[PDB]
Design an enzyme around this catalytic site. Structure first.
Site, PDB file in Angstrom:
ATOM      1  CB  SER B 127       0.275  -7.044   5.495  1.00  0.00           C
ATOM      2  OG  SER B 127      -0.166  -5.796   6.140  1.00  0.00           O
ATOM      3  CE  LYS B 182       3.051  -5.315   3.437  1.00  0.00           C
ATOM      4  NZ  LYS B 182       4.227  -5.444   4.224  1.00  0.00           N
ATOM      5  CG  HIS B 185      -1.241  -3.762   2.788  1.00  0.00           C
ATOM      6  ND1 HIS B 185      -2.420  -4.140   3.420  1.00  0.00           N
ATOM      7  CD2 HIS B 185      -0.472  -3.188   3.737  1.00  0.00           C
ATOM      8  CE1 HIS B 185      -2.353  -3.799   4.708  1.00  0.00           C
ATOM      9  NE2 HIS B 185      -1.182  -3.225   4.923  1.00  0.00           N
ATOM     10  CG  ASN B 186       3.061  -1.424   3.345  1.00  0.00           C
ATOM     11  OD1 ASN B 186       2.190  -2.165   3.951  1.00  0.00           O
ATOM     12  ND2 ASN B 186       4.358  -1.464   3.666  1.00  0.00           N
ATOM     13  CD  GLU B 189       0.325   0.514   6.860  1.00  0.00           C
ATOM     14  OE1 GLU B 189       0.295  -0.709   6.716  1.00  0.00           O
ATOM     15  OE2 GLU B 189       1.326   1.151   7.200  1.00  0.00           O
TER      16      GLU B 189
END
Ligand SMILES: O=C(O)[C@H](O)[C@@H](O)[C@H](O)[C@H](O)COP(=O)(O)O
Ligand SMILES: O=C(O)[C@H](O)[C@@H](O)[C@H](O)[C@H](O)COP(=O)(O)O
Lengths: 465, 466
Positions: B127, B182, B185-186, B189
């Site tokens: 990232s 991951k 995390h997105n 975000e």
């Protein structure tokens, strides 16, 4: 002598559908993988034209061709095992009807595999509970059109009937369209239940209404435009007393379970690009209710406000009533927009007005409200969103301030209103010509070089920020 | 000579990760299925230790053994095909690192298959956008610990370092754990961007701030506890103009696109039973933005209120700031609770404090805020929900009135605030010892005989409600 239809699966739903069919004049073959249940159905229903079979071969041979076999068994392996047990005895053209609460992609797969083997497959939703199955459910079949035409006389006879006398069954579309529509019906039901739950939270927390007052309130609401099966049973629930003379609803553990269709409808909205916030927040509200140990732990640590002065009682009750009705309108506009996206993706050419018509009776979400949707679809079959229909636009014009007042009151009082909040955010987002996604797109181009479009020039652009 | 490592996939992230590796002294083989992109990378980076290849066979043969190959290819069929094309040329012991945004279940399947075939495999999230790929991203690798140890040295060289100097890479866990982290995390975000977007709608809707005033506001917020990469770039975006003098933010089409990980995080919450409302509403907000023609049509026919009095300007801005910060806290509490549910479901024994630690720099959500999460998890590794940690509980006590005031203002003003309002509903539901789900359970028993449990005795019960 052969029968026109047979039912496999003698648990309550299959037994009740067999009895419903028998009540319309048919002699019905019945079979269950466990003989005991079949014997029990026969013992409990003397004088009924049910003919029990104890081997799959004899059951299949008892049916006139093209055979019509209704499967009411366990979803998953039990459905495939039932299909596989029938296959060796079937003839080309025979019709298997799966009335279970099957995920639609499994019906698409089964329909395609069976079609290659020369057999028809209709995946159908059946809504109405055990009582509806026995007396008149809403039926939502999808599969080969000609196979539907061959079973339609039976399905129309057993279906619930709307006020105008029309049976609550229609050909939904090809392959898995019927099970998709049943799934959406269940998503909508989740939303309606959560909207009613928030109304209950507001009335009890804001006005301290007793259960008798809540029952009286829901009774009055049920006499007007909110008239619906769910509001009607809610008034009954608030009247029900337990032995000690206290109300039963107050000792029920507040952990809402689920059997998937709610989660499925939201997962499909996510796959299709549909903003189905209300039904999805209803699923998440059941999920957080199921985290009771965590909620009790948090309740001992976290702080918040207490209920604010509610003002005039009648006025507060009317604002919650209006909020509930507009909230339903938003939830259904989102659901019907999802039906359109699904129809496009899965190539079903759905008839939205005919779908609303079969939800007018039999199913759990039945309400006079479905006639307003039927009407809007009739006047504009490809309407993009129900909020634009004249009747709904007028209700939003008149009831939105009550919804806004209810949400502002709840937020200041610490009363959670996920679906009423989602209704306002959706309404204010759908009517906004410009949303802050311009900043989101600028951010994505800044950090990931994703490019953006402009409102004044065609093409994709990238800026060296 | 042979190269120490090779990278397949020369789109933005892959090309920049290859340049990052080269900047640490390595000579890097590069390959892309669209060969013209490889030529472009070479033409644009003269003098760098990049060696281009134009067939997979030659690319693989160029690597010192045991080979290290990092794939940064589009998720799905593209990644599957890239990895299948490498296999015939590989030797047992070679190391395959999938650094694309691969769905975690694909990684779980691939990890077992490739390991049984004799290869070392790592499925890792990377990232940081274009700049973090080049200069130092957050890296979240999963797979067998032995495989991780074979690549830990090079991944440590290219990762971002936190302000305290700790590298933003750590062994996440088995099989698909790194790609799952991951994905989350997105999702976070998406949540952070939507929360910022609502703050923007509030400031513009309530105070009619100009783009310069928006930039000044975000700049000031960035100097305090909200300090973060996303707020830092937002203050820049508000003053950027095109050549004709138009503020870019006002000519950009308000249709937010997406490549899947946000949708995936929410579909995973639905599968795991987690009430991930803020991130999910952020995904739905991108979806409704994509219905631009529909919204423009609706804006001409549906009615709504006008903005209400915002009052003292400084006080309003501070309430929006507090609402944004508490909204982030709720979104991360939801996201970290989902990481725990996934760790339990997929058997990963995730170290939540270490995950927060590698998000302090590199990644798109980087912010000093992550240190607060790291501290809370270090103090209580199995904390059920971040809202219960002292720091976050205190911020909720202090800022919840601002958030409630902002949501009430917005709702009365017709300004959509899906994530701020979801934050309030979640906070008020999570702290509620009793919810109206007792009525839902009574309805389900009524129409479907589903049975219910009682608070005063054991067992399941069914009732004849009439
Ligand atoms: O339409 C119906 O007759 C019902 O909705 C039925 O299909 C459903 O399985 C449960 O009665 C409720 O759904 P949940 O169990 O997920 O609450
Ligand atoms: O972590 C990152 O470095 C970014 O998130 C990166 O993975 C990429 O920019 C994604 O494509 C953004 O997500 P969307 O394209 O779905 O907005």
């Amino acid at each position: 002598s052969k029968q026109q239809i047979g039912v496999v699966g003698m648990a309550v739903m299959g037994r009740n559908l067999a009895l419903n069919i028998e009540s319309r004049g048919y002699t019905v073959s019945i079979f269950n993988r466990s003989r005991e249940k079949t014997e029990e159905v026969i013992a409990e229903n003397p004088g009924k034209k049910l003919v029990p079979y104890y081997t799959v071969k004899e059951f299949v041979e008892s049916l006139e061709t093209p055979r019509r076999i209704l499967l009411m068994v366990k979803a998953g392996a039990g459905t495939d095992a039932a299909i596989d047990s029938l296959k060796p005895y079937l003839d080309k053209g025979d019709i298997i009807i799966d009335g279970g609460n099957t995920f639609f992609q499994d019906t698409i797969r089964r329909n395609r595999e069976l079609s290659a083997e020369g057999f028809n497959f209709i995946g159908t939703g059946v809504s109405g509970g055990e009582e509806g199955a026995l007396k008149g459910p809403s039926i939502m079949p999808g599969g080969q059109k000609e196979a539907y035409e061959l079973v339609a006389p039976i399905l129309t006879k057993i279906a619930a009937v709307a006020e105008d006398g029309e049976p609550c069954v229609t050909y939904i579309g090809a392959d898995g369209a019927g099970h998709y529509v049943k799934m959406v019906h269940n998503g909508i039901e989740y939303g309606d239940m959560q909207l009613i739950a928030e109304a209950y939270s507001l009335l009890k927390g804001g006005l301290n209404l007793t259960n008798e007052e809540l029952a009286q309130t829901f009774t009055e609401w049920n006499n007007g435009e909110l008239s619906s099966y769910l509001i009607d049973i809610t008034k009954d629930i608030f009247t029900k007393k337990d032995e000690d003379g206290n109300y039963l609803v107050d000792v029920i553990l507040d952990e809402a379970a689920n059997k998937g269709t709610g989660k499925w409808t939201s997962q499909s909205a996510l796959d299709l690009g549909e903003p189905l916030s209300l039904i999805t927040e209803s699923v998440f509200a059941r999920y957080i209710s199921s985290l009771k140990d965590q909620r009790v732990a948090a309740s001992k640590v976290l702080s918040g406000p207490q209920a604010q002065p509610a003002g005039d009682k009648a006025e507060f009750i009317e604002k919650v009533r209006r909020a509930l009705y507009l909230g339903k309108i938003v939830s259904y506009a989102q659901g019907f927009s999802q039906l359109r996206a699904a129809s496009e993706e899965y190539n079903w050419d759905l008839n939205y007005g005919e779908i609303a018509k079969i939800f007018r009776a039999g199913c759990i979400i039945r309400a006079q409200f479905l006639q307003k949707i039927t009407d809007a679809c009739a006047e504009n079959p490809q309407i993009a969103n129900l909020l634009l229909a004249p009747y709904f636009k007028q209700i939003a014009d008149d009831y939105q301030q009550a919804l806004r007042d209810v949400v502002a009151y709840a937020v200041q009082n610490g009363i959670p209103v996920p679906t009423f909040s989602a209704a306002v955010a959706y309404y204010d987002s759908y009517r906004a010509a410009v949303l802050p996604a311009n900043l989101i797109q600028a951010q994505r181009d800044y950090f990931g070089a994703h490019t953006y479009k402009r409102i004044d020039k065609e093409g994709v652009f990238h800026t060296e920020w």
